[PDB]
Symmetry: D2
Subunit: 116 residues, 4 copies
């Protein structure tokens, strides 16, 4: 509804998503940073009967037919409607590692998405 | 195969998942704590072609806390890695965000960690 | 040096700090949000021989002579100098809880500080 | 008294601290992993008058990874709570931020969790 569309973040990445009546999120993600190229599949869920913003989250595993970074990012946040819609999030990016390096496997950040 | 199955965290929550050959995660989650009752749908992704150096397999999934019985107006995302072996595990870090007004946006997200096992 | 001074964040809070030659950080914090009133003591450390931004962190326990919220926040980030100095951070706020509620003890966020 | 002492995390790092009556934490930290060698100074704060309902005691501390021997140009902050008893513990979540250029600021901070015990 308000969620379905094309969005961009401060890094220049692109998120295209469709919100299903059943609370599913499906689309593709195109990243401006890291070891990535071309599009990647995304899947997520959202509150389909919100009351405040609308809670949602989605994941991307950084593997496609061209590259594999052996990592995955999860974005957790809320959708805020109005004139200028926005998705405020915090993310976790975890890399596959050996046991010895597991302590440094996860990065944390925050991204804000603007609807086109 | 490795990931596909029924898992449990430290709180006693149950995670039932199927890992597709293609990278998809699909299943149901039942929580032991919080404003929840019954099963909830989950969706996620994982690295279907991990490295061959003994590294873990990266993955992540989301659950929106709404079902036929209740709605907490929130969602959690888990990000981590699957570590195979005799006693397999999924080590994660999670973020739970609630829908809030602007005045409360500063305290909308909780952070934690969960360890899943087959027992 | 560049760090010593008065700073403000997006919430309207105030951070007054002095950076010691030995890498110590000392000052007071005045919060615009939560269960807080008047000033609170802060203590931290910073890289006294940086190369990029300057790594630093500080803590505040939300107890003073007037109120006690039974909680503490830790800010971890980097100092970026220039015309307009800034401290970019991510924080963790943990509340004292019973065993049963420990899973919901910690909040995570991000704050940007501007130097006055 | 409860907090004051020598503690160890899961990685084998050593945390030696003194808790002042007033809310101060002061001590030294020795890391088992990462770009570190020897002891590092730490500083923090804690709730000197916790609640009487069986709740934990909130606390936090920072370490900047620079000493007489090396400098990693980074700092970690731990935030958590002390839980007294026969087998006392300090449960935490931590953030490690490295000094980076603007181009790398997106990947400057790592997140994790540590459990400290007296053994
Ligand atoms: O692009 C973002 O918006 C983005 C935002 C948050 C976290 C990660 C991100 N991207 N992370 C990668 C990682 C490995 C790659 O191979 C490609 C992208
Ligand atoms: O249940 C876990 O395993 C679980 C694990 C990690 C983070 C959160 C959790 N659960 N958080 C809730 C929130 C709202 C509810 O209505 C039910 C559960
Ligand atoms: O004010 C900030 O900048 C601030 C920024 C991040 C996290 C917490 C903050 N403040 N958190 C409190 C908590 C309890 C209180 O009693 C008073 C303030
Ligand atoms: O040592 C721990 O217990 C530890 C625990 C939690 C997070 C980080 C840790 N250590 N991170 C480093 C980083 C740079 C160094 O030079 C040495 C250690």
């Amino acid at each position: 509804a308000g969620i379905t569309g094309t969005w961009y973040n401060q890094l220049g990445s692109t998120f295209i998503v469709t919100a299903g009546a059943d609370g599913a999120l499906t689309g593709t993600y195109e990243s401006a940073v890291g070891n990535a190229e071309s599009r990647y599949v995304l899947t997520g869920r959202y509150d389909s009967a919100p009351a405040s913003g609308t809670a949602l989250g989605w994941t991307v595993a950084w593997k496609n037919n061209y590259r594999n970074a052996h990592s995955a990012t999860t974005w957790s946040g809320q959708y805020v409607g109005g004139a200028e819609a926005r998705i405020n999030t915090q993310w976790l990016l975890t890399s596959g590692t050996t046991e010895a390096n597991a302590w440094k496997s996860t990065l944390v950040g925050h991204d804000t998405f603007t609807k086109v």
